[PDB]
Enzyme design. Structure first.
Site, PDB file in Angstrom:
ATOM      1  N   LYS B 174       0.917  -1.288   0.048  1.00 48.17           N
ATOM      2  CA  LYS B 174      -0.085  -0.026  -0.026  1.00 48.17           C
ATOM      3  C   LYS B 174       0.648   1.195   0.088  1.00 48.17           C
ATOM      4  CE  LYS B 174      -3.630   2.500   2.141  1.00 48.17           C
ATOM      5  NZ  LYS B 174      -3.199   3.601   2.792  1.00 48.17           N
ATOM      6  N   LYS B 243       0.139  12.256   3.693  1.00 48.36           N
ATOM      7  CA  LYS B 243      -0.182  11.354   5.094  1.00 48.36           C
ATOM      8  C   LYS B 243       0.486  10.168   4.752  1.00 48.36           C
ATOM      9  CE  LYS B 243      -3.116   9.700   8.600  1.00 48.36           C
ATOM     10  NZ  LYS B 243      -2.621  10.519   9.616  1.00 48.36           N
TER      11      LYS B 243
END
Ligand SMILES: NC(=O)c1ccc[n+]([C@@H]2O[C@H](COP(=O)([O-])OP(=O)(O)OC[C@H]3O[C@@H](n4cnc5c(N)ncnc54)[C@H](O)[C@@H]3O)[C@@H](O)[C@H]2O)c1
Ligand SMILES: NC(=O)c1ccc[n+]([C@@H]2O[C@H](COP(=O)([O-])OP(=O)(O)OC[C@H]3O[C@@H](n4cnc5c(N)ncnc54)[C@H](O)[C@@H]3O)[C@@H](O)[C@H]2O)c1
Lengths: 291, 294
Positions: B174, B243
């Site tokens: 991811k 982020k």
């Protein structure tokens, strides 16, 4: 079947000029390096004629030259292509040079009333060998349309971008700027992945159907990184040269492209560390060195 | 093997739609959230509320978590009232939160001590993806446990992937996915500003690059769905991209790795946010760079 001239018989020019001979054209070749001339001749090309003689005799003359100087040395001056071009000749430059030089070339072609296209190519030596080059052509649409079929024996996608002579060059620079970003991203991302013990094969199978996908990822990883082979291919040095042209144009267009400028330094450092003549995919190895 | 009773802790941006989709798919779903409105909205669709984290661990076949931070994950998993200490012997816990590889490992070490099953299955795709069941699940941990729960996760997403038995492998992939996005969005943004500045036909240029080595799914995404039509509604915000870039950089620095362009990209997206594009789609980095046009 036409007489074609071909000036510049190097990494791209040799396979391109060879393909024209194989295609049934009579091809007259010129190169400063007599060895390159020897190789082309062994393919069935004719050597021994001057640049000027090519301009007087050939229906179309292609150039595949390594620098702006070389392009200038061949096109301009009393011995060059434009002064000696017969009234029906078409010149097609496949070299990558600055938009400004494209314009200088066109302006001299218009003054002599000869036809000129700036048609830089994409796809590398592999593309040249396999006739799968992409041609990105700026210049007159009538001239493009009459020479499209010849370019079509050398490449798989032949595009006319616009009537602006530098339109090809510009799209090409954009293309190669993106390649610089994609190669850097793969190189850094895979280094992170490896350091954390990922199976790079399984990772690729997933990312290749995700937003991590890019043709460059598939290329670099499947054809170079996975097989541990960094034989060019398309060099770190050539990529950095193209990024140079792109950053030059950005600076001339009053643009600050911070990541682009950084990338120019990244590939320049890869070179200074000894990966300059490796395939661009070797940026992976450069970034991994620290492991 | 019974997989009818599902617990779901974290009924937030992603959890609420996920949990409701489980209800709509015939599961008996027991939900928990600090947010009483979120609980009420879930209940209103046939969700069951009012049971503790503890009770979900004791009674549910599978319990999902969708939590906003490492600390929130820790607060839910560890301790006397948490998931691990109260899980029945056949329970499977699946965390869909994004946390560090190190936390994935600590969660799994606690799962093994308690002899309960745990998968670290971080999702990606946003609220709309959660609603539309087009989320991607990238899963690390036991293959047997994956095979047992794939059918549930699959009603919630389009792409469900088992990466490897390394518990952190889904998280790691991811993060790499999102890092490549960072690079690709940056290249598109800078390269198209150059093109625009020199009056190129951006539609024609895409036609060409999209079948050349300029091609990427991100270029297609950012150009055709955002830049071309001048739409900068997320999508996937600058702030949330950055982020995840931060998490990739933290992982790098943890592994003693210097990734100079990645670190530069984290700052580029931070500057883009500071300039006012933080809650825009990441494709808006094009507008940031384009502030330099006449
Ligand atoms: N090699 C690639 O992968 C690639 C890919 C796309 C585009 N290109 C572009 O194609 C062009 C040619 O590249 P290359 O890789 O074949 O370069 P190269 O250096 O391999 O070949 C250039 C040839 O031109 C000859 N030459 C130089 N000056 C000359 C002159 N005055 N007269 C005659 N011959 C001269 C050289 O002897 C050399 O053989 C460059 O502009 C490059 O950017 C290259
Ligand atoms: N927002 C997105 O677009 C998005 C997309 C993909 C992944 N993610 C990731 O998924 C995770 C969740 O994101 P989110 O946006 O849904 O967060 P959020 O803040 O909207 O939701 C988390 C929910 O957990 C609840 N919660 C926190 N601590 C709790 C506790 N002890 N007990 C019960 N409930 C508690 C909160 O009230 C909140 O409703 C994060 O790890 C995030 O990185 C978010």
């Amino acid at each position: 079947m036409k007489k074609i001239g071909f000036i510049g018989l190097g990494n791209m020019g040799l396979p391109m000029s060879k393909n024209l001979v194989k295609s049934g054209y009579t091809v007259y070749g010129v190169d400063l390096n007599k060895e390159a001339e020897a190789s082309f001749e062994k393919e069935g090309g004719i050597i021994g004629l001057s640049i000027s003689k090519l301009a007087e005799t050939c229906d179309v003359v292609f150039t595949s030259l390594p620098s702006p100087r070389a392009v200038e040395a061949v096109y301009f001056g009393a011995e060059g292509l434009f002064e000696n071009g017969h009234s029906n000749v078409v010149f097609i430059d496949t070299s990558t040079v600055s938009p400004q030089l494209n314009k200088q070339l066109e302006e001299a072609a218009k003054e002599k009333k000869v036809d000129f296209l700036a048609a830089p190519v994409s796809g590398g030596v592999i593309g040249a060998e396999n006739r799968t080059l992409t041609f990105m052509v700026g210049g007159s649409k009538d001239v493009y349309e009459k020479t499209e079929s010849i370019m079509g024996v050398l490449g798989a996608n032949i595009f006319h971008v616009s009537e602006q002579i530098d339109s090809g060059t510009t799209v090409k620079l954009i293309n190669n700027l993106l390649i610089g970003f994609y190669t850097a991203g793969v190189s850094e991302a895979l280094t992170l992945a490896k350091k954390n013990n990922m199976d790079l094969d399984k990772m690729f199978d997933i990312l290749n159907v995700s937003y991590g996908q890019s043709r460059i990822y598939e290329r670099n990883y499947k054809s170079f990184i996975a097989p541990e082979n960094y034989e060019p291919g398309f060099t770190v040095n050539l990529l950095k040269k193209d990024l140079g042209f792109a950053v030059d144009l950005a600076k001339e267009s009053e643009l600050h492209l911070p990541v682009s400028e950084m990338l120019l330094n990244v590939y320049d450092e890869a070179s200074q560390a000894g990966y300059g003549e490796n395939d661009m995919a070797a940026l992976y190895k450069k970034v991994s060195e620290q492991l």
